[PDB]
């Protein structure tokens, strides 16, 4: 792969690539479609609109939007203007967005109408710098000063040239969270999505122009931003976008061509979703679908899920690991070489190391902490120098995973070096769940650990000590939390216990709980 040039604007690079196919569909969702030519026009009009309201080069805008054809207009339009979109999870609380507005110093917000209520609460409570709120597909009347996305874009002539950015300039941020503390702003450059799209989208997956891409992972996840924006636009594939929560039925509807007259050829999602599909009574047959490739990431793929999928569809599931810090996948199975129970082999272009307890070498078959060296790594966590130093070794990125290298050069997942749990392939901190539980007046103490379900997928499990002299049923506790946590964070089971195993300092011995004590 040839490196990008030093003067490089990634949005211009994706528009230029598709000038050969102006009338092909670039994106289609449940109510709209853009051709490459329409996407270019709207992208450049939005770039002009952001500049016309005073947002300058290098400044941030918050992009809080459901998957749909306006999302890549917003993302690429900011980048074309050399403004930095901060693309965020759509399932967070007002308090999380308030933090993001302050931390990013976002100067504008591009928000889906269905997300406007949570955004409103974030704006009201924060010391933010937002100059304009631009609403895509409003779901209630606009407040004074707010502008509808379609009119904001339509009111401005297309910007004539992109910002003259450098390849190593910041282009966008994503946020990721650890087991405590606020979300961390992961800063990516213009070159980083070129590298992931060339080294993985093109050179590993072999995506091509005639593909129809469909990602159950949304565009704000680093996995989905590659799958359903940067990879397809790099090869001129058409992309199906879906705003609603991915369920088996919603996904099957699109597999069978129920939206936009298109059947996906490339599907993308978490192992939890593939298990949910394989359990569904109305799983389509082979002859009803056009899939040629199935990608998975976010959590380890249990071998039995890959094997059942291959037996049903005659397609393997290609499991690769990526992170928000590395932007996309750097260690993966290949479309034509899958070994289930491993994450495959290093993606050419990326170097992988396993380190022991002092940074030293680890013999094959022994676990070591995983470190990555490659060209798409983030530059830092914005405004967090300590956490940055810890993760950005020195050209090496620490992943927070342990791995074992096998005799054939493949790597087998061996768990995290922290307490985080990927449930449904999405981060869940057990300590957040514990903090929610102990605010119930009938709970005295709680401890949450990961436990493998019957499919070998990790789910949280809660051990709860009730407060003597209060009542507390399992049903009452399920109601308390349904209300306060996202569904993927719900404990699979709660066990009421008389006491928890502790050190003399009172530290809970969470390892004893995973050992089944
Ligand atoms: N296949 C896998 N097997 C085992 N663990 C996997 C995995 N893919 C992700 N992970 C886990 O999620 C972590 C990354 O989470 P994050 O949500 O930042 O990004 C993706 O999850 C992400 C970002 C871009 C592309 C792909 C995934 C990895 O450090 C690892 O613990």
Q: What phi and psi, each to the nearest 5 degrees, are found at residue 210?
A: -80, 5
Quote the ligand 1 centre to 328 CA distance (angstroms): 9
Say which residue the tokens 């928890």 belong to.
500
Of the chain, the end-to-end C-alpha distance in Å amounts to: 52
Distance from chain centroid for Cα 298: 8
The answer to whether the CB of 321 falls within 8 A of the CB of 299 is no
Q: Where are the domains of the chain?
A: 1-241, 242-316, 317-428, 429-517
- Directed axis angle between helix 271-279 and helix 248-255, to 10°? 80
- Whole-number Å distance, alpha carbon 425 to ligand 1 midpoint, is 7
Among 53, 61, 52, 57, CA closest to 81:
57
Tell me if 299 CB under 6 Å of ligand 1.
yes
Tokens of 259: 């939206």
Residue whose structure tokens are 């050829």? 265
What number does the ligand 1 atom closest to the CA of 319 have? 1
Cα distance between residue 333 and residue 328, in whole Å = 14
Separation of CA 217 from chain center = 6
Q: Which residue has the tokens 């918050």?
A: 62
Distance CA 165, CA 258 (A): 41
399 lines ligand 1 (CB under 6 A): yes
Q: Which residues are annotated as part of the binding site?
A: 298, 319-320, 324, 401, 416, 422
297 burial (CB, 10 Å; 0-12 / 13-18 / 19+) is: buried
Residue 354 near residue 369 (C-beta atoms within 8 A): yes
Paired with 421 in beta bridges are 428
- Tell me if 106 sits within 8 A of 80, measured CB to CB: no
Rounded CA separation 387/418 (Å): 14
* Quoted resolution (Å): 1.7
- Cβ of 371 closer than 6 Å to ligand 1, yes or no, is no
Atom 4 in ligand 1: which residue has the minimum CA distance? 300
428, 438, 473 from 480: Cα distances, Å? 18, 11, 11
The CATH number of the domain covering residues in 242-316: 3.40.50.12820
Pairing of strands 84-87, 170-176: parallel
CA-nearest residue for atom 29, ligand 1, is: 399
* Alpha-carbon torsion angle 156, 157, 162, 164, nearest 10: -80
> Quick one: CA dihedral 196, 200, 202, 208, positive or negative?
negative
Is the Cβ–Cβ distance between 87 and 63 less than 8 Å? Answer: yes
DSSP state for residue 419 in the 8-state scheme: S
Secondary structure percentages of the chain, helix, strand, coil, to 5: 30, 25, 45
The correct answer on CATH 3.20.20.80 for the domain covering 429-517 is: no
State how far the Cα of 35 lies from the Cα of 177, in Å rounded to an integer.
Answer: 35
Distance 222 CA to ligand 1 centre (A): 9
Q: What would the two tokens of residue 465 be? A: 């000590």
Distances (CA, A) of 19 to 22, 24, 102, 207, 495: 6, 10, 38, 18, 59
1-241 matches 317-428 in fold: no
Strands (E) in 177-224, as ranges, are: 184-189, 212-215
Closest CA to 8 of 161, 159, 163, 158: 163
Tell me which method was used to determine the 3D structure: X-ray
On the CB side of 240, how many CA atoms lie within 13 Å of its CA? Answer: 29
Pocket flag, ligand 1, residue 34 (CB < 6 Å)? no
CB contact at 8 A, 222 and 174 = yes
Q: Which residue's CA is the nearest one to ligand 1's atom 3?
A: 300
Return the CATH number of the domain spanning residue range 317-428: 2.30.38.10
> Residues annotated as binding site for AMP?
298, 319-320, 324, 401, 416, 422
Evaluate: CB of 422 within 6 angstroms of ligand 1. Answer: yes
Instruction: Please state which CATH number belongs to domain 1-241.
Output: 3.40.50.980
- From the CB of 274, is ligand 1 less than 6 Å away? no
List b or e across 335-348, with b for residues whose CB sees 16 or more CB atoms inside 10 angstroms: beebbbbbbbbbbe
* Residue 319 CB–ligand 1 contact under 6 Å: yes
Q: Which atom, in ligand 1's list, is nearest to the CA of 176?
A: 18
Residue 321 CB less than 6 A away from ligand 1? yes
Q: Tell me which residue of 441, 420, 383 sits closest to 104, measured CA to CA.
A: 383
């Amino acid at each position: 792969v040839t490196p990008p040039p030093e003067k490089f604007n990634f949005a211009e690079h994706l528009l230029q690539t598709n000038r050969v196919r102006p009338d092909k569909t670039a994106f289609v969702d449940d109510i709209s479609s853009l051709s490459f030519a329409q996407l270019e026009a709207q992208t450049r009009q939005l770039a002009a609109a952001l500049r016309a309201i005073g947002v300058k080069r290098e400044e941030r805008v918050l992009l809080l939007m459901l998957d749909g054809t306006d999302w890549p207009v917003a993302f690429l339009g900011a980048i074309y203007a050399g403004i930095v979109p901060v693309a965020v999870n759509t399932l967070l609380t007002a308090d999380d967005y308030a933090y993001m507005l302050e931390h990013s110093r976002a100067q504008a917000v591009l928000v889906s109408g269905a997300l406007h209520p949570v955004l409103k609460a974030a704006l009201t409570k924060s010391d933010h710098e937002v100059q304009r709120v631009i609403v895509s597909r409003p779901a209630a009347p606009l407040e004074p000063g707010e502008v509808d996305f379609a009119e904001f874009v339509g009111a401005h002539a297309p910007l004539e040239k992109p910002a003259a950015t450098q390849a190593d300039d910041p282009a966008f941020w994503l946020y990721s969270s650890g087991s405590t503390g606020r979300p961390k702003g992961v800063v990516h450059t213009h070159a980083n999505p070129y590298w992931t799209s060339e080294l993985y989208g093109r050179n590993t997956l072999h995506l091509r122009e005639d593909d129809v891409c469909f990602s159950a992972a949304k565009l704000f996840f680093a996995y989905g931003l590659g799958n359903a924006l940067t990879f397809p636009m790099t090869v001129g594939a058409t992309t199906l976008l879906m705003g609603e929560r991915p369920t088996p039925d919603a996904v099957f509807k699109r597999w069978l061509g129920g939206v936009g007259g298109v059947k996906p050829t490339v599907f993308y999602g978490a192992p939890t979703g593939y298990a949910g599909m394989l359990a569904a009574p109305n799983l389509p047959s082979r002859d009803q679908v056009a899939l040629r490739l199935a990608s998975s990431a976010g959590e380890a793929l249990p071998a039995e899920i890959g094997q059942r999928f291959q037996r049903h569809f005659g397609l393997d599931i290609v499991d690769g690991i990526g992170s928000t810090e590395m932007l996309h996948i750097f260690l993966s199975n290949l479309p034509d070489r899958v070994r289930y129970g491993t994450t495959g082999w290093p993606v050419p272009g990326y170097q992988i190391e396993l380190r022991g307890d002092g940074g030293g070498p680890v013999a094959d078959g022994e676990p070591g902490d995983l470190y990555i060296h490659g060209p798409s790594s983030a530059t830092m966590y914005w405004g967090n120098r300590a956490k940055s130093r810890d993760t950005f070794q020195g050209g090496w990125t620490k992943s927070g995973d342990k791995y074992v290298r096998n005799d054939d050069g493949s790597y087998t997942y061996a768990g995290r070096t922290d307490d985080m749990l990927k449930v449904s392939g999405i981060y869940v901190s057990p300590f957040e769940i514990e903090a929610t539980l102990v605010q119930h007046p009938g709970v005295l103490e709680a401890a949450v650990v990961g436990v493998a379900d019957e499919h070998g997928l990790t789910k949280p499990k809660a051990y709860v000590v009730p407060r003597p002299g209060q009542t507390l049923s399992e049903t009452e506790l399920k109601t308390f939390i349904k209300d306060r946590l996202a569904p993927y964070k719900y404990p699979r089971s709660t066990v009421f216990v008389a006491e928890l195993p502790k050190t003399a300092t009172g530290k809970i011995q969470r390892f004893k709980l995973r050992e089944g004590v």
